[PDB]
Amino acid sequence: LYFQGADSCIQFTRHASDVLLNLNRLRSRDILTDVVIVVSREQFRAHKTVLMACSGLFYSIFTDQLKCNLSVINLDPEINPEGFCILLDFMYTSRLNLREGNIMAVMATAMYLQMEHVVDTCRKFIKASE
Amino acid sequence: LYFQGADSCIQFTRHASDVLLNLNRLRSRDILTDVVIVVSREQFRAHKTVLMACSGLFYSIFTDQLKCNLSVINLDPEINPEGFCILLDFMYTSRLNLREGNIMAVMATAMYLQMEHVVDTCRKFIKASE
Ligand SMILES: Cn1c(=O)c2c(c3cc(Nc4ccnc(Cl)c4C#N)ccc31)N[C@@H](C1CC1)C(F)(F)CO2
Numbered sequence: 130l131y132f133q134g135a136d137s138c139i140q141f142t143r144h145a146s147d148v149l150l151n152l153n154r155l156r157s158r159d160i161l162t163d164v165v166i167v168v169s170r171e172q173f174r175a176h177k178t179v180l181m182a183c184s185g186l187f188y189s190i191f192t193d194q195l196k197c198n199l200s201v202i203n204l205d206p207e208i209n210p211e212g213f214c215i216l217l218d219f220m221y222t223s224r225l226n227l228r229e230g231n232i233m234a235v236m237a238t239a240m241y242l243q244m245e246h247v248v249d250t251c252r253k254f255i256k257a258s259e
Numbered sequence: 260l261y262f263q264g265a266d267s268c269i270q271f272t273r274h275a276s277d278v279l280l281n282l283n284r285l286r287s288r289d290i291l292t293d294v295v296i297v298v299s300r301e302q303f304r305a306h307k308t309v310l311m312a313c314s315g316l317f318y319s320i321f322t323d324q325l326k327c328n329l330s331v332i333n334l335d336p337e338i339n340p341e342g343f344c345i346l347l348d349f350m351y352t353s354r355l356n357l358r359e360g361n362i363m364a365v366m367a368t369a370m371y372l373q374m375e376h377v378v379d380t381c382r383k384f385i386k387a388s389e
């Protein structure tokens with residue numbers, strides 16, 4: 130449940146994961162979602178704070194004085210919707226559903242979105258299959 | 260960095276804590292904060308999604324069709340501002356700064372805010388000092 134942290138302060142082991150679980154439940158129920166990400170013919174509702182916390186691209190967009198107030202964000206039409214969906218799920222769950230059939234699209238999408246450790250992980254899995 | 264989850268899916272160990280760290284950085288810079296919590300003469304800016312994810316009281320308030328749109332929320336004037344501050348910091352960090360001089364106020368505030376495991380932890384620490 131809790132432990133003594135290195136800073137001599139009480140820390141709750143599952144707190145961060147339980148907060149993320151609740152943020153994903155709010156997303157699933159469309160509660161307090163404040164942006165729709167458009168990827169070709171597909172739309173994905175989300176919370177800007179979670180997107181900024183998980184992506185260098187979204188962090189840049191939503192800290193821009195003009196774009197921070199947009200309710201619709203259109204991604205590059207070359208982005209694969211399934212690749213984006215897999216990464217949005219990862220943002221809200223810490224689970225990345227990589228498969229042989231989606232890894233190239235997930236990697237290209239993570240490069241565009243500036244999610245470096247995901248890109249590095251994709252490169253390592255690709256290197257193992259060559 | 261990552262591991263094979265029980266659901267045979269790749270999971271990133273530090274993802275949830277790193278997201279929470281970024282949400283606290285946005286709070287510290289007042290980025291995308293969408294509510295001010297008023298506690299007697301003190302004001303605390305925050306993100307409604309994080310408050311709802313961490314409190315039964317805030318979850319009820321921000322799911323109410325009328326209150327979900329309020330930009331200012333006034334707490335009961337009997338709530339101690341320091342106790343609220345300690346709990347808001349806990350929400351964004353997983354670290355609870357309990358001390359002999361603040362534990363009663365933190366416990367009463369956590370009861371009001373419906374943060375059960377925090378209340379239980381406070382009760383256990385109080386029981387040890389009697
Ligand atoms: C480059 N980059 C990544 O490669 C990356 C990111 C990531 C996040 C920001 N956002 C921030 C940076 C710094 N400060 C502030 Cl307030 C914010 C905010 N808000 C920026 C660049 C990023 N986030 C992680 C999650 C934390 C775990 C991710 F795994 F989802 C993908 O990897």
Ligand SMILES: Cn1c(=O)c2c(c3cc(Nc4ccnc(Cl)c4C#N)ccc31)N[C@@H](C1CC1)C(F)(F)CO2
Nearest residue numbers: 147148151154155311312313314315318373374375
């Ligand atoms: C009663 N109660 C607590 O006692 C409690 C809570 C807590 C949260 C909600 N919020 C939700 C519930 C269910 N579903 C959805 Cl979408 C939401 C949302 N959003 C409700 C009741 C709660 N949150 C945890 C953090 C998760 C770790 C806390 F540690 F900060 C304090 O303990």
Ligand SMILES: [Cl-]
Nearest residue numbers: 131132133139
């Ligand atoms: Cl302990």
Ligand SMILES: [Cl-]
Nearest residue numbers: 261262263269
């Ligand atoms: Cl592994």
